[PDB]
């Protein structure tokens, strides 16, 4: 049956792109950039 909900306790954030688990929310956010770092799809005046 169901025992846990979100892991055991530690706040580990995984990358929805590759699936890398990072022990830091800030660290990951920086890693995910590697996935969104491809050819220019369609930039804007921002």
Q: In angstroms, what is the minimal distance from the CB of 43 to Zn ion?
A: 22
Q: Is 18 among the residues that bind Zn ion (CB under 5 A)?
A: yes
DSSP helix/strand/coil, 26: helix
Which residue of the chain is nearest Zn ion when measured via CB?
15
| Distance, CA of 14 to chain centre | 5
- Nearer of residues 17 and 29 to Zn ion, judged by Cβ: 17
Q: Give strand pairing partners of 22.
A: 13
Instruction: Please give the Cα distance from 46 to 36 (Å, whole number).
Output: 17
Q: Is 17 among the residues that bind Zn ion (CB under 5 A)?
A: yes
Return residues touching Zn ion (CB under 5 A): 15, 17-18, 20
């Amino acid at each position: 049956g169901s025992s846990g909900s979100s892991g055991t306790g530690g706040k580990h954030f995984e990358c929805t792109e590759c699936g890398k688990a990072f022990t830091r929310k800030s660290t990951l956010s920086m890693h995910q950039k590697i996935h969104t770092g491809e050819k220019p799809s369609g930039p804007s005046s921002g």
